[PDB]
C-alpha cells in the first residue's frame, strides 16, 4: 500500500519528512516509495539485486519493445507494408501520432479531466511521461514508417517482416550514430571521450554488454539539465501564445497537450531553440522536479533527487568513496580534502553536515556535485561510470552499426550522413532546424539552417 501508507513494511520504503521542511509541514506524512522488484524473491542466500526490464543495447527498444507480445502489438499487421501502428482517433496536421494504451489506472486522463486523452503506447512504458519525450517517440515512429515506405518502392517484392526489420535496423543505427557521434562527446568532454571511448575497432564477444546497477542511478545526472518549463515555438520560432512557457508540474503525463495543443512541431522547436539548464553546485535541480514531480496525478508531489538517493539505498549501492576507488580516483576523507575534490568548500561543508563522511555520500549526490569536465557536462566520477557503460554497450554489441557484416561499406557511408535535424525535416512540418551539432545549437536564428541545405539518407545501397 505504498501509494497511500506511511508504515515501513515490504515492499514500501517511504521517504520520511525532516523537521522544518519547505513544503511538507506534516512529519507523519512521507514521500511514497516502492522498493524495486528483487531478481530473486524471498531469498536467504543471494545478495538482493534488481532487474532490467529492457534490452541493454542501443537498438531503439523504446520504439520497438523489449518483449515479443508488446513488439507484435506495436506493429501494423493489417498489411505487408512493414509499418508501426499509429493512432486511429487523432493526427498531428495529417501526420501520425503514437497509438493510445489501455491502462487500468491511466495517469494521463488525470492531467486534464475534460479532455479524456489517455497515455500513449510505445516500446517503453514511459512515452507519455513528458510531451518532449512523447515528441521524440512520435518522431522515431514516423521515421520507421517513412523508411519502410521508401524501402517498399525500392524493393517491391519485400514482405512486411523484411520491411519492418530493415527499417528497424536503420532506426537502431541512427540512434547509435546520434548517441556516439553527437551526444556522448558533449556529455563527457574530449579527454573522457578519448579515455573511455577510444576509436571503435571491432565486436568483442568477451565484453559484458549488461547495464550495471550503478548506471541506473549515475545516468540520472540528466536531472540537473531539466528546465522548469515546457517551451513551445510557432512557425517563426517565436513564443506560441497562449501558454508558450507551461510549468513542468502541469506537463507530466499531459498526453492531451500533444493531441489538443498543436502536436509535436512546437515542442521540437522549443527543444532545439531553448538552452538546457546548466548544472551548478548551488543550482543542482529545479523545484518542478524536487517539489512538484507528478503533483497532479498523485496524492503528493514527489522529490526526484530524494528518490534518486533513496533508490540507490534500495539498490544497495556503495557510497561516493567506494565509487571513486573503483574509478581509480582519490577518496577524500575530510571536509578540506572534499573541498579540494569539489573545488568548493561551501558544498563540501553542506555534504559533511548531511553525511558525516565522504564514504556515505549517495552516488547521484556525489556525482552531480563534482565540477564539470572541460567541454563536458559531468565530473570525473560520472564520466567514468557513464563512459565505462557506453564502451561496454558498443564493444559488446554484435549488431553494432560499424561491426563487419552488420551493414555494407556503402550502407555504412550512407548512414554516416544521418542527423537528428534531418529526421525532424523528414517527419514534421518544420522547415528550419538546428545546425549540427543539434545538442550545442540553441539560439534562433544564429544556429539554425533551412532543411533544403541538409542532404537526406540515401537508401540506394538497400536495393536488391
Amino acid at each position: 500500500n505504498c501509494e497511500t501508507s506511511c508504515v515501513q513494511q515490504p515492499p514500501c520504503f517511504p521517504l520520511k519528512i525532516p523537521p522544518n521542511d519547505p513544503r511538507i509541514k506534516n512529519q507523519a506524512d512521507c514521500i511514497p516509495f516502492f522498493r524495486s522488484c528483487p531478481a530473486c524473491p524471498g531469498s536467504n542466500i543471494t545478495i538482493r539485486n534488481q532487474i532490467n526490464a529492457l534490452t541493454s543495447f542501443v537498438d531503439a527498444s523504446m520504439v520497438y519493445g523489449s518483449e515479443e507480445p508488446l513488439a507484435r502489438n506495436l506493429r501494423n499487421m493489417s498489411n505487408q507494408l512493414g509499418l508501426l501502428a499509429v493512432n486511429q482517433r487523432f493526427q498531428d496536421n495529417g501526420r501520425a501520432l503514437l497509438p493510445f494504451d489501455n491502462l487500468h489506472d491511466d495517469p494521463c486522463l488525470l492531467t486534464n479531466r475534460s479532455a479524456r486523452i489517455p497515455c500513449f503506447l510505445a516500446g517503453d512504458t514511459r512515452s507519455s511521461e513528458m510531451p518532449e519525450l512523447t515528441s521524440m517517440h512520435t518522431l522515431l515512429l514516423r521515421e520507421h514508417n517513412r523508411l519502410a515506405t521508401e524501402l517498399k518502392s525500392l524493393n517491391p517484392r519485400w514482405d512486411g517482416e523484411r520491411l519492418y526489420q530493415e527499417a528497424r535496423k536503420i532506426v537502431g543505427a541512427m540512434v547509435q550514430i546520434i548517441t556516439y557521434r553527437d551526444y556522448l562527446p558533449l556529455v563527457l568532454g574530449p579527454t573522457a571521450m578519448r579515455k573511455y571511448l577510444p576509436t571503435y575497432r571491432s565486436y568483442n564477444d568477451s565484453v559484458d554488454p549488461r547495464i550495471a546497477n550503478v548506471f541506473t542511478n549515475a545516468f540520472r545526472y540528466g536531472h540537473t539539465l531539466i528546465q522548469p518549463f515546457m517551451f513551445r515555438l510557432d512557425n517563426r520560432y517565436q513564443p506560441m501564445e497562449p501558454n508558450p512557457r507551461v510549468p513542468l508540474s502541469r506537463v507530466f503525463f499531459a498526453s492531451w497537450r500533444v493531441v489538443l495543443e498543436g502536436g509535436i512541431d512546437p515542442i521540437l522547436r522549443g527543444l532545439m531553440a531553448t538552452p538546457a539548464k546548466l548544472n551548478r553546485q548551488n543550482q543542482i535541480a529545479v523545484d518542478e522536479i524536487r517539489e512538484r514531480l507528478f503533483e497532479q496525478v498523485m496524492r503528493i508531489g514527489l522529490d526526484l533527487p530524494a528518490l534518486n538517493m533513496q533508490r540507490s539505498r534500495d539498490h544497495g549501492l556503495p557510497g561516493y568513496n567506494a565509487w571513486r576507488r573503483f574509478c581509480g580516483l582519490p577518496q577524500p576523507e575530510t571536509v578540506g580534502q572534499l573541498g579540494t575534490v569539489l573545488r568548493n568548500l561551501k558544498l563540501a561543508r553542506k555534504l559533511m553536515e548531511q553525511y558525516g563522511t565522504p564514504n556515505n555520500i549517495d552516488i547521484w549526490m556525489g556525482g552531480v556535485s563534482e565540477p564539470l569536465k572541460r567541454k563536458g557536462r559531468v565530473g570525473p566520477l560520472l564520466a567514468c561510470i557513464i563512459g565505462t557503460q557506453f564502451r561496454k554497450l558498443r564493444d559488446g554489441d554484435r549488431f553494432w552499426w560499424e561491426n563487419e557484416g552488420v551493414f555494407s561499406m556503402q550502407q555504412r557511408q550512407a548512414l554516416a550522413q544521418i542527423s537528428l535535424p534531418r529526421i525532424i525535416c523528414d517527419n514534421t512540418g518544420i522547415t528550419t532546424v538546428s545546425k549540427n551539432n543539434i545538442f550545442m545549437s540553441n539560439s534562433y536564428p544564429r544556429d539554425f539552417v533551412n532543411c533544403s541545405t541538409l542532404p537526406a539518407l540515401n537508401l540506394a545501397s538497400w536495393r536488391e
Partner: protein, 103 residues
C-alpha cells in the same frame, strides 16, 4: 540460438552467442561492486532507526535534497553551449537502456 541471423531479437536474446541472455530484457543487472545493505543481503541503509552506515547516522534523502539540491527557481543558469534537446535525447536514450520494475 541460431548459427545464422540477419537481425536483432526483440529481447536481446542471442546477441552474445557464448552467454545468450547478456543484454537481454527481464534479467538481473550486473554489479561492478558488491552490494551494501544494513543486514548485508536485503535491507537498505536507513531502514532500521539507529543503525549507522560506516560510523555515521544515515541522512534522510529528503533532508539532503532540501539542504543541498534546493535553489530558488528564478536564478536558473541557462547553458550557453547546450539545447534542451541535449536533456531530451538523454532521457530518450535512458529509455532504450534501462527500466527498473516495481511491485
Amino acid at each position: 540460438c541460431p548459427e545464422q541471423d540477419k537481425y536483432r531479437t526483440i529481447t536481446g536474446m542471442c546477441n552474445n552467442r557464448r552467454s545468450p541472455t547478456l543484454g537481454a530484457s527481464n534479467r538481473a543487472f550486473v554489479r561492478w561492486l558488491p552490494a551494501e545493505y544494513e543486514d548485508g543481503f536485503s535491507l537498505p541503509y536507513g531502514w532500521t532507526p539507529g543503525v549507522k552506515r560506516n560510523g555515521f547516522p544515515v541522512a534522510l534523502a529528503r533532508a539532503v535534497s532540501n539542504e543541498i539540491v534546493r535553489f530558488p527557481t528564478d536564478q536558473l543558469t541557462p547553458d550557453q553551449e547546450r539545447s534542451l534537446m541535449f536533456m531530451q535525447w538523454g532521457q530518450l536514450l535512458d529509455h532504450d537502456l534501462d527500466f527498473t520494475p516495481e511491485p
